[PDB]
Design a protein around this ligand. Structure first.
Ligand SMILES: NC(=O)C1=CN([C@@H]2O[C@H](COP(=O)(O)OP(=O)(O)OC[C@H]3O[C@@H](n4cnc5c(N)ncnc54)[C@H](OP(=O)(O)O)[C@@H]3O)[C@@H](O)[C@H]2O)C=CC1
Ligand code: SF4
Ligand code: SF4
Ligand code: SF4
Lengths: 101, 154, 216, 199, 60, 68, 347, 134, 395
């Protein structure tokens, strides 16, 4: 809670020096070049709760935690089993991007 | 007549399998292992496999490398220019199933999506002896065919 | 300047003492004092050249990048004749998402410098191709991968991605597998692009520990 | 040798420069004017008689008679070290019990995500896999899975002749991997005994 | 190896013991050119050279 | 600014065809064929509303359908 | 547009996915004659949507190579040794199949197989084998438009007899009856072109009066898909004629125009003369193997089927009932294949 | 360094060396001491446009004075090359390269900043320094 | 009132497709030519773009080493070396001397194989096929050393963070030393056939001329710099391993033409042989990987006997080490030039951004300037001297 006193110092300082120009909502999505049906998907902005198995507070929103913890996640879609090998097949392009990055 | 047709078909199989003119689609890592397989230490020209630069004069095609979405039309175009027998060998994990770039936006998961594949050579890169094993597997596949007997009994 | 071969024997030295000192410890202060308007902040950190030394990183704004680069190349004391690469890093948490990074070499100083320009999706960065001819392809790649527009570029075109690709793949919001897939159709004797289907989905393994502290 | 003639060059503009200017006589790499009659005859016979060509001809003709280096691939096989990473194989204990304990580290370390594992408690009570399949069209044969396994259950065997005629046969499963381990057991065991000394 | 029976990582922990200090630089204070060029050689004899580092750091 | 970026990208799309980066089959696949398919399409005007048709088709409407 | 299910019993349970190559369709299909011109496109349509297709073929690895690419892993099953006279093999082929499509037919006779064998005996035996199973839900048979019991040509007569036998054994079977099919691998335009260019004279039976309704291969393949996606189509015969009806003279003229032939190479080989020139050559065919030099065109059966109007009956089912608009075969993508040869700006 | 030419040439001639390594491409002029003096004095005249109390101008003045001194004690042109670690030709080209950017610096005037300008500087401290000793 | 003078127009916008006697890989090259002379060259790349940089972001640091082996299939060791050096800098890990020696040794070996392939494939593109086959036997001899140390002839993945994957097998140093005793004679055999040959001289002299200013302007490195008169080597100017101890001389040429770069590459092979001999004689004894087990896996007997070693093995083969937040760019003197990795870490077990700096990317950019005024035949030679690898260019 005091200070990381490491590269994060310069990271935050670069954050506060610079800023982004305001644009109308949704305009950047057209610039992105992805299929427009991507934005029809609904978004949940949440912070994961602590796993009950472990007692560490890093993943939680705690003054100890210095990492980004708020995720954008998209709703879960259909999943099936590969007829030949029983692998989990999917057609959702946004399956793991939000959770992972 | 049934004996003569068999002698003819086995002679044709010997001719096709002994003289394989392969065209090498050397995209990536595996092309150098093929280079080594056709080098002095392994003599493919003793086996009768001698590489031909143009598709029209080649009967076997070896896809050795990572197929990309940018290349797949050119791969299909080269394959179509080949004459009728046109056997295709898939070499390497990249060509077989996309391999280590399988979960990529720009990579085709296996040349089988674009062109039919007769023999799959596994490896990253496949050892030269493994490539010769796959070529012998293709030669056995050619030997197995008896086209002239079926023409007689068609 | 240009490290033309001069000494035939006994050039065992990595460089002279004064040249090392001026760049080991006075380089950032010299840059800030000489050209203060261009520089906004400076970071001294682990060295690009070696593990033991330290090289500067300078943060500047997009408007001043061309003049700062021209000063860096042709200043007598600082002769960064080479542009190693141009890169962008996407930080979605920030309002100004993209940090365009310039890496330079001074053969005379035997030193490396890193220049960062922080922009967003709409703003553009002036091209530095007139200063370094190598920039042209690097800026084309940055435009392709991240979508950063470079102003006054001689011909800004995509390089790596497939023809007709509209998305920018290295953006953190772009799916790892993408949106489309390529297949040959027998009916229409053409190779065609289709929406993505995966036989086996990419398996993300969450390995993060609660007890870790290094994550910022 | 390294020395170059004013006439021989690959660029038209350089040929024009050397034909109409004498800066080539200043340059050290070039060959200087003969300055004697005998030197003129020497250069003239060297160029006109293709002397340098014949010198290469003898060295190439040495190729005809020297010992050929080649291997008859079916009859003779190239040397293969114990460390060689080839076709995968699940292993069994000498009692006949599979070494795998479904730790799933090999699936976590797989750079290519070629291993899918799912397990259960067996009726006796052991931790055993109900599924262990490897995609050999996705494998990169790095050997990381052999490094991560704590019980030596998964090893990359010494077999490189495993080409197939259809892609479906290249999707291995637990039974196939166990059969491959049974087939190559003694060779794998010898290779592991040799490798244990180093690591 | 003296690490077999003597285990102390915190003494040998270099990964997590790095930090970043902060300074502020201003244009008002003049740069010290005496440091840069006072130590510079004026004749060939006074030339001093930095030798190439032979090895990179190792724990031994 | 977004308009400028969109115009630049559209100019790139035109230049690909103009400079022969893309091929004849690309033009067939991506523009001409879908337009001709749309003209040749005969469909029965569904009495069921939009909700009912998607309900009959699939559980998750957001997932795309191929070869509809 | 909303994807329509394959109307097969218990399909709703098994089906899952968007309907693409990697999706699961609840259709397992045994397409006899898969390596043929018609069969390959039907296999492509069924397998493209994630379904599994069993393709029995007479041993020929190079001929069945395109079918390998058609589907994902394990979806296209190629059975090596297919014989029309082997019952046990037919039972094995349709063991897991819930739809069976029969595209097996011969344009010409040989010594080994006659019309009566392939077009009559095989349909009856296969019909019995499918009937005894019960798992097979849909049966589709492909026949010519001009097939009739009272037809001079033996091919078109045997085909109609076989269709009647199939209708007798399986009452719910659908008889697809397309016209002359145009495609890249077709035997209509390709044979006409070969006749115009590498033959000394192009004999035209009568003056080309006979009317025909050619259709594009993609249209027939889509019609097959629409048959399988509707259970109400069962037990009905569909005459899949093309959008436009053309006499053979118009088609010959338009091929000459598109190819930019110097002049007209077609000659008038009127009927009652082909019936004397080719009549011995049919007996020649029945005692000799398949020969590329002479075939199909040079037969009395072809002359007999080119003296009648092979057009759809007025009251009949067609593309409109399947909600398909057939594409014109004289323009657009359909005509590209002949167009590539020469257009007068080419070579 | 090692010459890759089989022909035998003398590298102590101090002209065959320059011809071999291709300094003539950089400048066709011989590059004598007087040219270096003229170039430094021309740079000093040029940097007069920059305001007198500008840090850039002070830097250029100091560098030019240092090199004019190095020219002073060293009467040998090769000695100047040894002290400055450069060929005289590239030393002369250096001042012209400095001359090219004076117009670009006079258009934006980087030296103009407010009297409260402050550039934050972040410095890295190595763990090896603290762990071994203090 | 003085007449004006008109000019001429250029056409023939040819497409030079993937072509086998050229630098290996697929090259699509669009050339605008006035007659038989080239006026513009526009290389089309992306035909082997596999999205490597983005794939790295989804993998752990140890899971991403084989990517660098496969970036350049000709020179694997040098490519993975920069990645492991960057991770070591961020992790503050010190490599033991034996592992440093092994890295330098194998880097020189891969340098030699790279130069053999470059020279002999360039000669093949010219049209001489004997040096090519004469070289494969040597390259096989070196691939057998690779297969001995790692079990893979090409994609070894031998270099690891903090050292090497396994120790040198017993008997290896003798075999390498024998290969070294005969290497100089083999190189002399190749050099006699190539050097001094009139057709080779005519084909290569004064083709692809580059000047020192041009090389620095376009960001070129390695043989291109050293063939123009630039005494710049990373192994000497910015040493990264026990290279500083090693005694070798930079090869320098001045013309900048194709012939000069061929001579430079041959001399680089000889210098690498000298460095290998020094490595062999001075090879130390001791640890080959770092003693720290929070960044390197424990040995197998040690994990099977100690609880802490089993914990470290489990957490290193499942989660991996956590790299402190920071950025670094580490470059190595690859055989093709300067190869560098710009690694951005936010403190996790996966790289946030891993930019790969291609030495061949800048050379292919320089192609247009170099191949101005040339002929259709000269393009193959110019491509040969650049020695571009398109998997390396297209990441
Ligand atoms: N113009 C057209 O294309 C039209 C076609 N049709 C009908 O559709 C059917 C097929 O069309 P098409 O595909 O053009 O004909 P093809 O001859 O092109 O396809 C015939 C298929 O039947 C197989 N076959 C033939 N005889 C036998 C046999 N005795 N035993 C086993 N397999 C056999 C062939 O295999 P192999 O290759 O080994 O002989 C081939 O796969 C025919 O009945 C035809 O009348 C309907 C309207 C028009
Ligand atoms: S399979 Fe491996 S060796 Fe072959 S091209 Fe792909 S990455 Fe390279
Ligand atoms: S060798 Fe490597 S890629 Fe193959 S299964 Fe093992 S860990 Fe995965
Ligand atoms: S093979 Fe080894 S690493 Fe993989 S699950 Fe079994 S015991 Fe674990």
């Amino acid at each position: 809670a005091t200070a990381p006193q490491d590269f994060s110092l310069a990271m935050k300082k670069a954050d506060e020096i610079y800023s982004g120009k305001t644009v109308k909502a949704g305009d950047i999505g057209f610039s992105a070049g992805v299929p427009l049906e991507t934005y029809n998907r609904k978004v949940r902005i949440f912070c994961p709760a602590k796993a009950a198995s472990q007692s560490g507070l890093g993943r939680t929103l705690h003054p100890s935690s210095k990492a980004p913890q708020w995720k954008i996640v998209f709703e879960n879609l259909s999943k099936w089993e590969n007829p030949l090998m029983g692998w989990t097949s999917t057609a959702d392009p946004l399956e793991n991007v939000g959770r992972s990055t | 007549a049934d004996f003569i047709v068999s002698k003819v078909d086995t002679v044709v199989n010997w001719a096709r399998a002994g003289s394989m003119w392969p065209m090498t689609f050397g995209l990536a890592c595996c092309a150098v292992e093929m280079m080594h397989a056709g080098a002095s230490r392994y003599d493919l020209d003793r086996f009768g496999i001698i590489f031909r630069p143009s598709p029209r004069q080649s009967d076997v095609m070896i896809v050795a490398g990572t197929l990309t979405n940018k290349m797949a039309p050119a791969l299909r175009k080269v394959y179509d220019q080949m004459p009728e027998p046109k056997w295709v060998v898939s070499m390497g994990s990249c060509a077989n199933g996309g391999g280590y770039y399988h979960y990529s936006y720009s990579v085709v998961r296996g040349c089988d999506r674009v062109v039919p594949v007769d023999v799959y050579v596994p490896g990253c890169p496949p050892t030269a002896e493994g490539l010769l094993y796959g070529l012998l597997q293709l030669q056995k596949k050619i030997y197995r065919s008896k086209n002239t007997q079926l023409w007689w009994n068609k | 300047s240009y490290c033309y071969a001069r000494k035939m024997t006994d050039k065992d030295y990595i460089a002279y003492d004064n040249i090392k000192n001026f760049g080991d410890n006075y380089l950032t202060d010299y840059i800030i004092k000489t050209v203060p308007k261009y520089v906004t902040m400076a970071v001294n950190g682990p060295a690009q050249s070696s593990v033991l030394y330290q090289e500067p990183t300078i943060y500047t704004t997009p408007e001043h990048i061309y003049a700062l680069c021209a000063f860096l190349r042709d200043h007598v004391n600082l002769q960064y004749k080479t542009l190693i690469d141009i890169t962008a890093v996407d930080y979605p948490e920030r309002s100004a998402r993209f940090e365009v990074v310039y890496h330079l070499l001074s053969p005379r100083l035997n030193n490396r410098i890193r220049i960062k320009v922080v922009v967003d999706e709409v703003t553009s960065v002036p091209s530095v191709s007139r200063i370094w001819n190598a920039a042209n392809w690097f800026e084309r790649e940055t435009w392709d991968m991240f979508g950063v527009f470079f102003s006054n570029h001689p011909d800004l075109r995509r390089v790596l991605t497939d023809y007709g690709f509209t998305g920018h793949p290295l953006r953190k919001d772009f799916p790892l597998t993408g949106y489309t897939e390529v297949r040959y159709d027998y009916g229409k004797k053409r190779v065609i692009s289709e929406p993505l289907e995966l036989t086996q989905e990419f398996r993300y393994f969450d390995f993060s520990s609660p007890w870790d502290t290094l994550s910022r | 040798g390294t020395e170059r003639r004013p006439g021989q060059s690959g660029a038209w503009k350089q040929v024009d420069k050397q034909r109409y200017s004498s800066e080539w006589e200043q340059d050290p790499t070039f060959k200087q004017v003969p300055k004697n009659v005998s030197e003129v005859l020497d250069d003239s016979v060297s160029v006109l008689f293709l002397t340098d060509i014949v010198r290469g001809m003898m060295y190439s003709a040495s190729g005809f008679f020297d010992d050929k280096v080649t291997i008859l691939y079916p009859f003779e096989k190239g040397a293969v070290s114990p460390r060689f990473r080839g076709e995968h194989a699940l292993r069994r204990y000498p009692t006949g019990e599979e070494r795998c304990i479904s730790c799933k580290l090999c699936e976590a370390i797989c750079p290519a995500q070629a291993i899918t594992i799912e397990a259960e408690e067996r009726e006796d009570g052991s931790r055993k896999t109900t599924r262990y399949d490897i995609d050999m069209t996705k494998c990169i044969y790095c050997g990381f899975c052999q490094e991560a396994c704590p019980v030596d259950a998964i090893v990359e065997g010494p077999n490189f002749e495993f080409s197939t005629e259809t892609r479906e046969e290249l999707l291995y499963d637990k039974q196939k991997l166990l059969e491959n381990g049974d087939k190559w057991e003694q060779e794998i065991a010898a290779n592991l005994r040799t490798e244990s000394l180093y690591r | 190896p003296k690490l077999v029976y003597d285990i102390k990582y915190f003494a040998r922990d270099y990964r997590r013991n790095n930090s970043y200090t902060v300074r502020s630089v201003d244009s008002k204070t003049p740069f010290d050119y005496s440091k840069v060029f006072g130590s510079a050689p004026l004749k060939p004899a006074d030339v001093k050279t930095v030798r190439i580092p032979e090895v990179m750091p190792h724990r031994g | 600014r977004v308009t400028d970026l969109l115009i630049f990208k559209g100019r790139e799309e035109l230049e690909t065809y103009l400079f022969m980066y893309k091929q004849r089959h690309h033009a067939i696949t991506e523009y001409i064929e879908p337009y001709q398919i749309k003209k040749l399409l005969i469909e029965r005007k569904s009495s069921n509303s939009a909700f009912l048709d998607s309900f009959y088709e699939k559980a998750y409407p957001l997932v795309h359908s191929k070869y509809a | 547009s909303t994807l329509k299910p394959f109307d097969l019993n218990a399909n709703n349970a098994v089906r899952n996915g968007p309907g693409g190559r990697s999706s699961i369709g609840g259709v397992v299909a045994t397409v006899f004659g898969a390596n043929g011109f018609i069969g390959s496109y039907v296999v492509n349509e069924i397998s493209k949507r994630g379904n599994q297709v069993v393709c029995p073929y007479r041993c020929n690895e190079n001929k069945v190579q395109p079918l390998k690419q058609m589907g994902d892993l394990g979806q296209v099953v190629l059975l090596p040794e297919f014989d029309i006279h082997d019952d046990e093999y037919i039972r094995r082929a349709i063991s897991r199949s819930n739809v069976v499509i029969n595209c097996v037919g011969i344009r010409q006779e040989t010594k080994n197989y006659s019309y009566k064998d392939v077009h009559v005996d095989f349909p009856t035996r296969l019909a019995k084998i499918v009937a005894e199973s019960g798992k097979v839900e849909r049966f589709i048979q492909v026949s010519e438009m001009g097939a009739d019991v009272s037809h001079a040509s033996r091919r078109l007569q045997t085909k109609a007899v076989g269709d009647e036998a199939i209708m007798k054994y399986i009452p719910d079977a659908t008889i697809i009856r397309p016209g002359n099919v145009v495609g890249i691998e077709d035997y209509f335009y390709n044979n006409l072109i070969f006749q115009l260019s590498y033959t000394i004279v192009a004999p035209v039976i009568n003056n080309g009066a006979n009317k025909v309704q050619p259709t594009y291969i993609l249209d027939v393949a889509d019609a097959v898909v629409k048959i399988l996606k509707d259970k109400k189509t069962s037990g009905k015969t569909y005459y899949l004629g093309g959008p436009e009806t053309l006499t053979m003279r118009q088609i010959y003229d338009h091929l000459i125009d598109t190819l930019r032939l110097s002049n007209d190479d077609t000659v008038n080989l009127r009927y009652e003369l082909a019936k004397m020139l080719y009549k011995p050559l049919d007996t020649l065919r029945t005692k000799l193997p398949e020969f590329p030099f002479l075939g199909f065109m040079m037969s009395s059966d072809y002359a007999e089927e080119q003296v009648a109007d092979s057009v759809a009956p007025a009251g009949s089912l067609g593309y409109k009932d399947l909600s398909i608009s057939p594409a014109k075969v004289t323009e657009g993508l359909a005509i590209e294949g002949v167009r590539f040869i020469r257009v007068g700006g080419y070579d | 360094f090692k010459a890759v030419a089989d022909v035998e040439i003398d590298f102590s001639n101090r002209a065959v060396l320059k011809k071999y390594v291709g300094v003539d491409h950089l400048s066709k002029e011989q590059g004598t001491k007087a040219k270096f003096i003229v170039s430094l004095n021309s740079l000093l005249e040029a940097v007069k446009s920059v305001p007198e109390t500008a840090e850039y101008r002070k830097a250029i003045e100091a560098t030019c004075q240092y090199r004019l001194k190095v020219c002073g004690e060293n009467n040998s042109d090769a000695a100047i090359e040894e002290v400055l670690d450069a060929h005289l030709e590239e030393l002369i080209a250096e001042s012209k390269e400095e001359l090219r950017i004076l117009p670009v610096l006079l258009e934006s005037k980087p030296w103009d900043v407010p009297a409260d300008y402050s550039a934050p500087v972040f410095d890295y401290v190595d763990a090896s320094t603290i762990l071994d000793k203090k | 009132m003085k007449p004006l003078t008109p000019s001429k127009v250029s056409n023939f916008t040819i497409n030079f497709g993937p072509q086998h006697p050229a630098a290996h890989g697929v090259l699509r090259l669009v050339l605008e030519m006035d007659g038989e002379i080239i006026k513009r060259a526009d290389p089309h790349i992306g035909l082997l773009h596999r999205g490597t940089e983005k794939l790295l972001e989804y993998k752990t640091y140890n899971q991403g080493i084989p990517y660098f082996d496969r970036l350049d299939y000709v020179s694997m060791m040098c490519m993975e070396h920069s990645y492991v050096l960057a991770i070591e800098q961020l992790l503050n890990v010190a490599v033991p001397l034996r592992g440093q020696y092994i890295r330098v040794l194998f880097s020189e070996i891969t340098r030699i194989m790279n130069h053999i392939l470059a020279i002999t494939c360039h000669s093949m593109d010219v049209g001489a096929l004997t040096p090519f086959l004469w070289a494969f036997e040597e390259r096989e001899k070196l691939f057998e050393f690779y297969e001995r140390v790692s079990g893979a002839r090409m994609h070894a993945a031998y270099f690891r963070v903090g050292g090497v994957a396994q120790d040198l097998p017993i008997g290896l140093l003798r075999d390498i030393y024998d290969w070294s005793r005969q290497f100089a004679s083999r190189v002399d055999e190749m050099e006699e056939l190539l050097t001094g040959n009139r057709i080779w001289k005519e084909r290569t002299i004064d083709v692809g001329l580059v000047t020192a200013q041009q090389a620095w302007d376009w960001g070129c490195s390695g043989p291109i710099l050293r063939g123009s008169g630039i005494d710049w080597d990373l192994r000497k100017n910015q040493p990264y391993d026990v290279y500083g101890r090693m005694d070798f001389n930079v090869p320098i040429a001045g013309h900048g033409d194709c012939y000069d770069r061929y001579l430079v590459r041959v001399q680089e092979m000889r210098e690498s042989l000298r460095i290998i001999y020094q490595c062999l004689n001075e090879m130390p004894d001791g640890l080959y990987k770092t003693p720290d087990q929070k960044v390197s896996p424990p040995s197998r007997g040690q994990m099977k006997q100690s609880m802490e070693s089993l914990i470290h093995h489990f957490k290193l083969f499942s989660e991996g080490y956590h790299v402190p937040a920071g950025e670094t760019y580490r470059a190595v003197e690859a055989p093709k030039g300067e190869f560098g990795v710009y690694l951005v870490s936010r403190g996790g077990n996966r790289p946030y951004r891993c930019k790969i700096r291609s030495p061949g990317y800048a050379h292919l950019q320089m192609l247009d300037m170099v191949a101005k005024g040339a002929m259709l035949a000269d393009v193959v030679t110019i491509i040969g001297t650049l020695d571009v690898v398109f998997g390396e260019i297209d990441r």
